[PDB]
Amino acid sequence: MNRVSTVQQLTKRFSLGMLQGRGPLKLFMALVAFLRFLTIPPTAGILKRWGTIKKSKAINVLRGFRKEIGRMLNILNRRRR
Amino acid sequence: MNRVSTVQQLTKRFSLGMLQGRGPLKLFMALVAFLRFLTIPPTAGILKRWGTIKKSKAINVLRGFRKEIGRMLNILNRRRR
Amino acid sequence: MNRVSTVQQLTKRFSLGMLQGRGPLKLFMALVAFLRFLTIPPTAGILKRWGTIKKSKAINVLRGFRKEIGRMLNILNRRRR
Amino acid sequence: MNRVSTVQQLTKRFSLGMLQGRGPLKLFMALVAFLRFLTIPPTAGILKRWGTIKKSKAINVLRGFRKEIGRMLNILNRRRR
Ligand SMILES: Nc1c(C(=O)Nc2nnc(-c3ccccc3)s2)sc2nc3c(cc12)CCCCC3
Ligand SMILES: Nc1c(C(=O)Nc2nnc(-c3ccccc3)s2)sc2nc3c(cc12)CCCCC3
């Protein structure tokens, strides 16, 4: 039903608060990964929350991210030869 | 100081055009990974660039991101809780 | 109760859609006035809606804006001598 | 073409810092007028700049804005509906 977002829909979803480390743990961890991929320093709010996340839950989320990059690599590899 | 970004600095860097698939390949790929991590549908402009991506360069970028997820697991491994 | 906004509160209120000419008539007219004050060209969406607004209602809103600039001038004049 | 702005162009021009009271006096005064038109409370940074404004320059800017409201009334006067 909803396979494509509009730019307006994404701006509605990605509020300024997430840049201060607000939001669901999965959103926060995805944003930290995004900044680290780009070597962009975190905000004070992101660094504060980075210190308080639960080790085991954060590790579980990151294993999921590692798998998802694997899925993306499978799509691109299966596209060329 | 370049250990922390201001929210102002991040809003400046992450211009609206990146939601239409504009920018350096590393920025584009980091955004695509971020959206896939969160199961957020891409925009038409993101999907068009995904479809026409230089596959070898994109694979190299994603391999680097996967190494960075490993580095994030290694940071969290050191914690007691 | 609410005499001051946070930056986050204002970003919540001022969605991307208003730059496309979406929103209450008063919001739209305030934005058109803001752009005209700065001699910034409108977007296609703003120019589209500018053509469809009701003359008498739009004029009423603008008379209110004219009065409000008068109130602001009264505050600044009463501050110096 | 400089008869229309893109939404992208406007997001570029209207940086987050202006919500903290940063920018050219004309930009600051246009934003203060816009918020007052809509009865939206200012931020602490906007209020601080309002309190310390160069009153003569600010009055000159607002007189120009009031002339522009007149020009907008003159445009709408010409319409049949
Ligand atoms: N530019 C963005 C956004 C954006 O510009 N949102 C805006 N919302 N309102 C805006 C605005 C700006 C000026 C006037 C009126 C409204 S811009 S949201 C967003 N989310 C992401 C990105 C960018 C933006 C890319 C970085 C990865 C996180 C996801
Ligand atoms: N920058 C603004 C806004 C803004 O940056 N909103 C954002 N919302 N989400 C953003 C974002 C950006 C990147 C990543 C995640 C979230 S920026 S809203 C807004 N509203 C006004 C102005 C600016 C902004 C000034 C012009 C007069 C209209 C009122």
Instruction: Give how far the C-alpha of residue B31 lies from the chain's centroid of Cα atoms, to the nearest Å.
Output: 4
Dihedral in degrees, nearest 10, Cα atoms A29, A32, A37, A40: 170
Query: Chain D closest CA to B45's CA: distance in Å?
Result: 14
Could you tell me the resolution of this structure in angstroms?
1.5
B71: nearest Cα among A79, A66, C11 = A66
D29: nearest Cα among A63, C51, C68 = C68
Three-state secondary structure call for residue B23: coil
CB contact under 8 A, C11 and A12: no
Dist. CA A29–CA A57, nearest whole Å: 10
**Ligand 2: centre distance to CA A33 (Å):** 23
Task: Establish if B75 touches chain A: CB-CB under 8 angstroms.
Answer: no
B48: domain CATH number? 1.10.10.930
A49: left (phi over 0), alpha (psi -120 to 50) or beta: alpha
C-alpha separations of D15 from A12, A27, B28, C10, D12 in Å: 17, 24, 22, 13, 6
CB contact under 8 A, B81 and A34: no
In the block, residue with structure tokens 């120009």: D64
Is D19 in contact with C59 (CB distance < 8 Å)?
no
Is A79 in contact with B59 (CB distance < 8 Å)?
no
Shortest-distance ligand to the CA of residue C19 = 1
Number of domains in chain B: 1
**Method underlying the structure:** X-ray
Query: Chain A closest CA to C21's CA: distance in Å?
Result: 13
CB contact under 8 A, B11 and D12: no
D19 CB under 6 A from ligand 2?
A: yes
Dist. CA C13–CA A31, nearest whole Å: 23
Burial of C66 from C-beta contacts in 10 A (0-12 / 13-18 / 19+): middle
Is D68 in contact with D34 (CB distance < 8 Å)?
no
Task: Establish if B60 touches chain D: CB-CB under 8 angstroms.
Answer: no
Dist. CA D79–CA C55, nearest whole Å: 7
| CB-nearest partner of B4 from A29, A43, A72 | A43
C-alpha separations of A72 from A27, A37, B53, B55, B60 in Å: 19, 15, 12, 11, 12
Q: What share of chain A is helix, strand, coil (3-state, %, to 5)?
A: 75, 0, 25
Three-state secondary structure call for residue C28: helix
Q: What are phi and psi of C42, to 5 degrees?
A: -70, 165
Q: Which of D47, D72, D73, D80 to mutate to test the interface with C (most CBs of C within 10 A)?
A: D72
Dist. CA C28–CA C51, nearest whole Å: 12
C-alpha separations of A29 from A8, B13, B63 in Å: 23, 19, 19
Shortest-distance ligand to the CA of residue B33 = 1
Is A47 in contact with B11 (CB distance < 8 Å)?
no
Instruction: Give how far the C-alpha of residue B72 lies from the chain's centroid of Cα atoms, to the nearest Å.
Output: 15
Is B34 in contact with A31 (CB distance < 8 Å)?
yes
CB contact under 8 A, D12 and B8: no
CB contact under 8 A, C30 and D32: no
Is C20 in contact with C43 (CB distance < 8 Å)?
yes
Query: Chain A closest CA to C53's CA: distance in Å?
Result: 23
Give the domain range for residue A12. Answer: 1-81
